[PDB]
Each structure stands twice: as C-alpha cells, then as structure tokens.
Design a protein around this ligand. Structure first.
Ligand SMILES: CO/N=C(\C(=O)N[C@@H]1C(=O)N2C(C(=O)O)=C(COC(C)=O)CS[C@H]12)c1csc(N)n1
Length: 263
C-alpha cells in the first residue's frame, strides 16, 4: 500500500528513468516516510559522513586528534583533490581533511580519513559500533564510486543512512562537542545547492553531504532545521540503468520538494 507521498515519489522515479531511494525521519514524532527504504544504493561521497564521524569518535578519547597534521604526498592525489592539491609535500590536519572531504567532496581527503581508521573496514566497524548494521565501506577513493548495478560494495539503504545521520547529528552517537562539529561541517557544505537544498524552503537551515558516481548516481543526505519545529533527516539516493547516464541533482531537489509538503 502507498501514500500520496510515495505515489508522487514513484511518479518522479518513473519520469526520471532511474531508481530512487528516499528516507525521511521527522524527529517531532519519530515517524519515517520511505521509498525503496530497504533497497541498497551505492553511497558514493555520502559515505564520507561515516568516515568523518568515525574520526570524531576517536577524538573523544584522543583530544588533540583533530589537530594532528597528516602528510600529503604527490602520490596521494586521486581524481578530485580541490583542497588536498594545495598541500602536496605539506600537511593537512584531520580536522582540515574532514572539512575538505565533507565540504568540498575532496577524494584525497577521504582517503586520509579512511587510512586513519585503518582502511575501509575501520569505517564499517564504526558504523557497527553505533548500531548501523547495513552500511558497508569496501574500497577507497576513487573506486568506491563505481556504482555498478548489483554490486553490494560501498552501499547502504536509505532507512539505515537516515537513522545513522539522525544519531550522528541530532542523537548521541557522538559526544556533544563532536556532534556539534559534524553539524558545523555539514552546514557549511559547498556542493549541495542543486540537491536537497534546492527543494526546501530557503528559511530552513540545512546540513548535507552529496555523492555522485557512474550510472548517473546522484545522492544527498541532509539534516534539516525547519522554521519553528523539530528537525528532520532526509536521505535521497538515485541511480540509473546505464553507466554514463548524466547526473540528476534535480531529481533529489524534486524528491525533497515532495517530502516537504505538509511539514
Ligand atoms: C570514480 O569516481 N567517480 C566519481 C567520484 O569521484 N565521485 C565522488 C563523489 O561522490 N563526489 C562528489 C559529490 O559530492 O557528488 C563530487 C561533487 O563535487 C562538487 C564540486 O560538487 C566530486 S566527485 C566525488 C564520479 C562522480 S560523477 C561520476 N560519473 N563519477
């Protein structure tokens, strides 16, 4: 059985020619609205939230960890390095790497976060530790974005990622200081203007992390503070049948617009 919300999302999906996954959590009453909420989708860059959060968790017992400089070698650079390329044969702190990964989608920065955690398995272990039984990170940048049909690697479900994002940014999966830091980073994201943000009222405060990959994979996960009511969490994942499909950030904006009706 479907609601009018789900019917609108299905119609959007059909018009788009792809596969759409949505999960909304309204923290006013803890209700969820889902569309393909339990199907796996390639996370691409939305996985960077879990990596940054894992490092924040480490820093709860290692107080200066975020300020630890990490060397950036020429050989570290991968396919998209807008911030890390400015520090070749130099350093970035784990805070700087987190900010670059989250706010500029820097892939070299993500690889340093992954390395700090002992590899992709270290990111997954953190996910399990905070109760996310679904998330899996298998690869480093750039190959974690291959978004191949049927490939379970580097996937999660909209429901799991929404629950996790809620716990990380509004709940207490992190310490109070670390939760606030993650919120600060997400709020300052530079890559999200055309995605979930474009489908929500401009007066609402939004923190988000985008992701993109092959098969026209176009993703965004967001924590949302509407005008005068409890915050929301929204995950929008989208992927398409053919490898070189174009990005469709407009589909994410449209999904957000649909979800926001009556909120
Ligand atoms: C093998 O890796 N392939 C990638 C890829 O690096 N995706 C990553 C991801 O998620 N990113 C985001 C992202 O956050 O969406 C942006 C966006 O950065 C900015 C400036 O908005 C830059 S690319 C990076 C890719 C991306 S699209 C396509 N066919 N492939």
């Amino acid at each position: 059985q479907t609601s009018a919300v789900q019917q609108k999302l299905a119609a959007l999906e059909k018009s788009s020619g792809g596969r759409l996954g949505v999960a909304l959590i309204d923290t006013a009453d803890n209700t969820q609205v889902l569309y393909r909420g339990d199907e796996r989708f390639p996370m691409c860059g939305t996985s960077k939230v879990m990596a940054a959060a894992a490092v924040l968790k480490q820093s709860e017992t290692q107080k200066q960890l975020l300020n630890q400089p990490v060397e950036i070698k020429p050989a570290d650079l991968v396919n998209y390095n807008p911030i890390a390329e400015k520090h070749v044969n130099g350093t970035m702190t784990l805070a700087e790497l987190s900010a670059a990964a989250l706010q500029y989608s820097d892939n070299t920065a993500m690889n340093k976060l992954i390395a700090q955690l002992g590899g992709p398995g270290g990111v997954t272990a953190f996910a399990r530790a905070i109760g996310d039984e679904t998330f899996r990170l298998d690869r480093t940048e750039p190959t974690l974005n291959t978004a191949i049909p049927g490939d379970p690697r580097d996937t999660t479900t909209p429901r799991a990622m929404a629950q996790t994002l809620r716990q990380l940014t509004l709940g207490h999966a992190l310490g109070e200081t670390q939760r606030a830091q993650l919120v600060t980073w997400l709020k300052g994201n530079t890559t999200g203007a055309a995605s979930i943000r474009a489908g929500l009222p401009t007066s609402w405060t939004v923190g988000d992390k985008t992701g993109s990959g092959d098969y026209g994979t176009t993703n965004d996960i967001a924590v949302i503070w509407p005008q005068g009511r409890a915050p929301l969490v929204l995950v929008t994942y989208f992927t398409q049948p053919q490898q070189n499909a174009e990005s469709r950030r407009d589909v994410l904006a449209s999904a957000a617009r649909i979800i926001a009706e009556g909120l």
